[PDB]
Write a protein that binds this ligand. Structure first.
Ligand code: HEM
Lengths: 423, 57, 54, 446, 51, 54, 105, 49, 105
């Protein structure tokens, strides 16, 4: 038995830096840094410089040689990647606890020590084009990701890639500026897992001072709702039709998560009729062929939308998508069971469970705690807050979704598809 | 008390040099695997995927 | 890289004998050729040595 | 702290047990509030015999197909309404089936597991229809062509020879699918004594035995009769073929040299060796600084579009080696790389890398041990093959014992002067002859 | 610039090549023998004694 | 040009049959060849380098 | 290029009035014999610079063929010469000292 | 749709040692390449003379 | 490839039982010595055809090396041979007759 198992220490640096040492007695090493540098903080002054930087960790560093850095990184042979999110960019090192300091040093370097070398940068450029290649690549990178690119619409769609028209144009001015403009203690979140809150505090102190963030959530990112319309010639059509949800942290946010579960998503047990949803069960009763619809969460603190990602062959798109809306209408009827509600709470709440879970999808989930939670409203309290599940707002919500301007998204030719004005 | 993550099958890229890239982000879209003629490819001007390193005690 | 690929004089060489792609169907019609040169070489060779005394 | 080994001890201890069939039940009881409830469905990819072709893939398509104790949508009701998890991951001799659940739910799916264990039905409706969904869904469902790549490495570069035998079996068989394959050869195959009672999560092993008796009991009791031969060693194919494609736009190339399988004691360092090998990722950056010297020149020369050390498994043998991607060029120097690197390997050892890939297997070592399902299945094949579990300090022991003398030598022992797998995909002309490429299998570097 | 290949690394490299080095060396030497059959060494050769 | 001096120097040196002065003469000329090239020329090179300062 | 360096770098100034370089108005850095390090060194050179050294070089060839030289006035200003590469170059000296370094490692 | 291929029988060409699916060339190879290597060296040592 | 043409094209049938081609199962058209006209002629060839002639050709090489031939049964069916190119080819004969024609013009 550990001396009573260490409770992860949540804190904020007195400086206004997010100071998080989650004491983990676990054997391995998990090192997060959550950055407001995620796409939200991004700006139209630049393009893909986060796609870039996302590549550019390897770049020539101030006081650290990307080859020498590569020698230490390459040396321990551990896990260091900053993570690309709309909210954050996260410097991650999972490794043997020993090199942590070096890692930390590397970390300290990685974060704080860009040289942004012209020569180096220029070189780096092409690897991006490679990157965008990966980005758009395959029905995951294409029909999911490029049809994320063909799905994701707003400044969240400000890409994990860059713009084509922007191609090759990055500036080192835009580097030192960009971080100087973007990178900041405003973006500063440090999260230890496995280490000494004291030691993390040690390097943290002697190292990490910064500041300097900026303004706003979007145009209301211009709410076109409506189509991002894409002629594809996709063979089997890839169309995805966008309902909406609610903002991050919104009171109803959780409720939106319900509605998600209500229509549900991919099953925990494979190979099934998708028997579980009016979007699915009534895609089951409704639909006879390949189809998918699901709700996103594009969660600003400010706003949000949960669409339906959709999949089907062209012929039924009017048929299906209309039926989609139809089922949506049908759904918005407010007809629901109680076992719908509870067994939902089982399904989705379990969502929070595996969603919270284990050593990697700990570091990615309990590391979406060790980064992305911020406290435990425990599976006690957050699943109390989850137990705070309440159905009616899903009815009035059914209206609410029915009530807005939402988006449609097009991959294909609409010759069989609806255009949503003709809806 | 600060939250980023988990809704399964959307995209918020994760990439590195040591590693490779990916985005599994919040929201779905992964459900398509069902039909007959389940086919699937390789061999022409492409990328693929899937690596990792995992071992033991 | 591969010096076989790399070395310029070799670059000829591989291009000449070694790396040389050649019809697989190839037939015994061949042999004589190298023979002759071998012959020729020996020819010279001997003649030479022959010359040496003669 | 208590160092990686005394952390390895400090990493808590899993436990295992043997239920009375001789039935096998092992426990990792954890803080996992959910859990991976392995009912480890032990019917794998290679476990099957010649005319038995496809019956396990069909069985896979049959695995969730619905049953009596729980009907199909009912299986979806207890199960799906429960919002639970099921997979079938099929391997040479064994496989698994996950259940993700509230540890609270622990009994329920166990119950489900049992009928899974038993009540899976061949329904002349399903057997017509779900098996029109098998005849169809399967029938055309085949064609995955990375399984014509990676399983060209398996369905080709792994031969189909009785031991090399492929997985899916014939489309002629697809027509020829039988209840005799299911009515009979499900039973005529499926044999519980080998099935795995697999415990991952927060859990009570005492309760494990309990519910075992409660439901899981009464399984292997009916078992045996005839037909249980062993593996008669022989040679896998030993060849190459280009599916000859102008249509293959760019090589998806590859190669491999022994990958793990179940058995041999050597693969330990071979693991480490494969580490020294390593996988050169296209998406990977940093080639200028790349560790695998191969990888390096590959960057400098821009010498290929991918290579990934890929370990192909059979008890005591296999092939572990690079995937690859390339244009009209690379392959030649690639082997000059690869085999030469191997040659380089077979000679050139420096402890540095040895320690490096040691740390590789350490980190990675977590990454298997780390993770709930990875640990889960890890238990599954762990006893399946092993019957033991290399303890954290056992695997860290032979691991700890790692010896670079055995690198030079043992390298020579397994590696030297052989003919392991190489498979590109596409216009392979840079594939030299066995009289060249596999002349390249030999070293004039000395 | 011997320091270039002078390091415990390349040192170890030598430690590797050494036995082989003996081998190829022997190859050369014996070659000189049989090729030459030079009387100087030839004498010691028993039953390779040619008279 | 100095080395050259050593050279055609060596000529006229040979330009005499074996002679008292010559003995020493060429005797030094060799040193030159060894110096004026192997030493004095290389030594020179190093020197010029030092001067270079750039 | 001044008296110590008009004697010494006045092998490059007074005695490259004699050995030509600076009185030919050459670029000090440009005098480095081309090597690999030199090569990629230049590959990393600055652009406006690149043009500059270009015009310098070509011109040098020009009078060279002409076997003439610029006005002794036009002959280059002594001292007063940016060391063009030397920050960049010398940086690379550290580079190949670095590749050379971990190389040593 | 793509997986259905198969391969032919080497027997007619097969040397004896490989006849069985029963046994490992773990024994055989060194003997086979041995015999050949022998022959080769015969050609090298003789040719040397 | 029948008796007149098993004597005559039975230089290609009975006497390419003797001269080999058709008893080797060759492709009549394929026998044309490669020429430029032949060259681009094939460049225009039909696809499924191209495969066919390919397998034919390779196989021919195969037994050739093997210095064997297919079963005399497997030896090609007489007559009963599409003239593969000859529409395409002969078309080209008109082509080079056309380039050749206005050429004459
Ligand atoms: C440059 C290399 C060759 C040299 C140095 C060479 C020199 C000689 C000499 C000196 C003789 C007279 C001595 C004797 O008859 O044994 C001779 C004879 C001859 N060699 Fe060559 N020759 C050379 C290449 C050839 C070639 C290319 C041929 C044509 C195959 C050739 C065919 C002859 C013939 C026909 C004779 C006279 C017949 C005889 O051997 O009695 N030799 N050669």
């Amino acid at each position: 038995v550990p001396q009573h198992p260490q409770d992860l220490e949540f804190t904020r640096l007195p400086n206004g830096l997010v100071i998080a040492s989650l004491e983990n007695y676990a054997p391995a090493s998990r090192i997060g840094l959550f950055i407001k540098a995620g796409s939200r903080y991004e700006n139209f002054n630049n393009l893909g410089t986060s796609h870039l930087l996302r590549l550019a960790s390897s770049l020539t560093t101030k006081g650290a040689s990307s080859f020498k850095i590569t020698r230490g990184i390459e040396a321990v042979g551990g896990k260091l990647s900053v993570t690309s999110t709309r909210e954050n960019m996260a410097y991650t090192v999972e490794c043997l606890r020993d090199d942590v300091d070096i890692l930390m040093e590397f970390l300290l370097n990685v974060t704080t020590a860009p040289e942004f070398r012209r020569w180096e940068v220029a070189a780096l450029q092409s690897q991006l084009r490679i990157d965008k290649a990966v980005a758009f690549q395959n029905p995951q990178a294409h029909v999911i990701e490029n049809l994320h690119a063909a799905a994701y619409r707003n400044a969240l769609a400000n890409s994990l890639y860059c713009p084509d028209y922007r191609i090759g144009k990055v500036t080192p001015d835009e580097l030192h500026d960009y971080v100087q403009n973007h990178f900041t203690s405003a973006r500063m979140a440090l999260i230890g897992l496995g280490v000494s809150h004291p030691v993390l505090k040690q390097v943290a102190e002697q190292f990490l001072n910064i500041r300097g963030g900026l303004g706003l959530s979007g145009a209301k990112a211009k709410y076109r709702g409506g189509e991002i319309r894409e002629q594809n010639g996709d063979s089997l059509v890839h169309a995805a039709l966008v309902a909406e949800s609610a903002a991050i942290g919104s009171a109803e946010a959780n409720a939106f998560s319900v509605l998600q579960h209500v229509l549900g998503a991919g099953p925990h047990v494979k190979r099934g009729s998708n028997a579980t949803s009016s979007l699915y069960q009534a895609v089951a009763k409704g639909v006879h062929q390949p189809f998918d619809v699901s709700a996103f969460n594009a969660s600003y603190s400010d706003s949000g939308l949960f669409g339906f990602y959709t999949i089907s062959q062209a012929a039924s798109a009017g048929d299906v998508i209309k039926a989609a809306y139809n089922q949506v209408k049908t759904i918005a009827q407010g007809n629901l069971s109680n076992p719908d509600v509870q067994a939902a709470k089982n399904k989705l709440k379990a969502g929070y469970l595996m969603s919270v879970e284990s050593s990697e999808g700990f570091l990615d989930e309990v590391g979406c705690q060790a980064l992305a939670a911020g406290s435990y409203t425990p599976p006690s309290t957050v699943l109390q807050q989850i137990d705070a599940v309440a159905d009616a707002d899903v009815i009035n919500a059914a209206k609410k979704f029915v009530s807005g301007r939402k988006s449609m998204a097009a991959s294909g030719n609409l010759g069989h598809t609806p255009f949503i004005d003709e809806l | 008390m600060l939250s980023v993550a988990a809704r399964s099958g959307p995209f918020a890229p994760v990439l590195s040099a040591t590693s490779r890239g990916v985005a599994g982000a919040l929201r779905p879209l992964v459900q398509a695997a069902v039909p007959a003629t389940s086919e699937s490819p390789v061999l022409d001007l492409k990328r693929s995927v899937l690596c990792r390193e995992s071992l033991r005690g | 890289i591969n010096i076989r690929k790399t070395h310029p004089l070799m670059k000829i060489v591989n291009n000449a004998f070694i790396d040389l792609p050649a019809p697989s169907n190839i037939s015994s019609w061949w042999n004589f050729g190298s023979l002759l040169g071998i012959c020729l070489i020996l020819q010279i060779l001997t003649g030479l040595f022959l010359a040496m005394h003669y | 702290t208590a160092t990686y080994a005394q952390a390895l001890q400090s990493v808590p201890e899993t436990q295992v047990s043997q239920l009375d069939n001789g039935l096998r039940v092992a426990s990792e009881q954890s803080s996992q509030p959910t859990c991976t409830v392995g009912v480890w469905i032990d019917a794998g990819s290679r476990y099957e015999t010649e005319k038995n072709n496809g019956a396990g893939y069909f069985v896979e398509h049959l695995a969730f197909k619905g049953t009596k104790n729980r009907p199909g949508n009912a299986l979806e009701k207890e199960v799906e309404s429960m919002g639970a998890h099921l997979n079938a991951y099929s391997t040479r001799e064994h496989t698994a089936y996950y259940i993700k659940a509230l540890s609270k739910d622990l009994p329920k799916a166990v119950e489900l597991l049992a009928d899974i264990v038993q009540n899976c039905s061949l329904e002349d409706s399903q057997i017509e229809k779900e098996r029109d969904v098998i005849l169809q869904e399967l029938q055309e469902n085949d064609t995955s062509m990375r399984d014509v790549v990676f399983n060209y490495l398996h369905a080709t570069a792994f031969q189909g020879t009785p031991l090399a035998q492929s997985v899916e079996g014939p489309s002629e068989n697809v027509r020829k699918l039988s209840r005799a394959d299911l009515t009979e050869y499900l039973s005529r195959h499926y044999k519980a004594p080998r099935m795995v009672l697999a415990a991952a999560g927060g859990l009570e092993h005492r309760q494990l035995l309990d519910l075992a008796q409660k439901h899981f009991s009464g399984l292997s009791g009916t078992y045996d009769e005839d037909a249980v031969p062993t593996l008669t060693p022989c040679r896998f194919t030993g060849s190459e073929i280009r599916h000859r494609e102008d249509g293959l736009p760019l090589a998806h190339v590859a190669i491999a040299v022994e990958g793990p399988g179940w058995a041999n004691p050597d693969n330990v360092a071979l693991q480490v060796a494969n580490a020294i090998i390593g996988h050169y990722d296209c998406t990977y950056g940093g080639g200028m600084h790349l560790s695998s010297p191969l990888a390096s020149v590959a960057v400098t020369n821009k010498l290929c579009q991918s290579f990934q050390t890929f370990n192909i498994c059979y008890a005591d043998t296999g092939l572990l080696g690079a995937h690859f991607v390339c244009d009209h060029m690379s392959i030649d120097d690639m082997m000059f790389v690869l085999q030469g690197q191997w040659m380089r390997l077979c000679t050139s050892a420096t402890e540095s890398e040895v320690v490096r890939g040691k740390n590789l297997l350490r980190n990675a070592l977590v990454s298997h041990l780390d993770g709930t399902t990875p640990v889960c299945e890890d238990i599954g094949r762990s006893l399946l093959t092993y019957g033991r579990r290399i303890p954290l300090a056992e695997w860290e022991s032979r691991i700890a014992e790692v010896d670079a003398r055995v690198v030079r030598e043992v390298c020579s022992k397994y590696f030297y002067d052989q003919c392991p797998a190489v498979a590109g995909f596409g216009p392979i002309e840079q594939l030299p002859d066995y009289n060249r490429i596999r002349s390249g299998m030999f070293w004039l570097r000395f | 610039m011997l320091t270039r290949f002078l390091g415990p690394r390349y040192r170890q490299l030598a430690r590797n090549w050494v036995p082989t080095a003996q081998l190829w060396g022997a190859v050369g030497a014996v070659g000189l023998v049989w090729a030459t059959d030079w009387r100087l060494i030839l004498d010691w050769v028993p039953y390779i004694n040619g008279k | 040009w100095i080395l050259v001096a050593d050279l055609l120097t060596l000529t006229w040196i040979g330009g005499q049959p074996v002679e008292h002065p010559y003995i020493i003469i060429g005797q030094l000329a060799s040193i030159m060849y060894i110096l004026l090239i192997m030493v004095m020329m290389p030594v020179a090179s190093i020197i010029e380098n030092n001067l270079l300062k750039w | 290029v001044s008296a110590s360096s008009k004697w010494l770098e006045g092998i490059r100034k007074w005695y490259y009035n004699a050995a030509g370089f600076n009185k030919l108005g050459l670029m000090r850095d440009d005098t480095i014999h081309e090597n690999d390090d030199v090569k990629e060194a230049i590959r990393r050179l600055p652009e406006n610079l690149y043009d500059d050294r270009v015009f310098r070089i070509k011109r040098a060839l020009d009078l060279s063929m002409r076997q003439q030289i610029l006005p002794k006035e036009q002959w280059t200003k002594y001292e007063e010469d940016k060391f063009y590469l030397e920050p960049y170059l010398k940086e690379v000296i550290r580079e190949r000292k670095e590749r050379e370094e971990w190389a040593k490692k | 749709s793509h997986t259905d291929i198969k391969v032919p029988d080497f027997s007619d060409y097969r040397r004896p040692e490989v006849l069985d699916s029963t046994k490992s060339s773990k024994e055989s190879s060194e003997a086979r390449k041995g015999f050949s290597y022998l022959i080769t060296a015969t050609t090298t040592v003789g040719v040397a003379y």
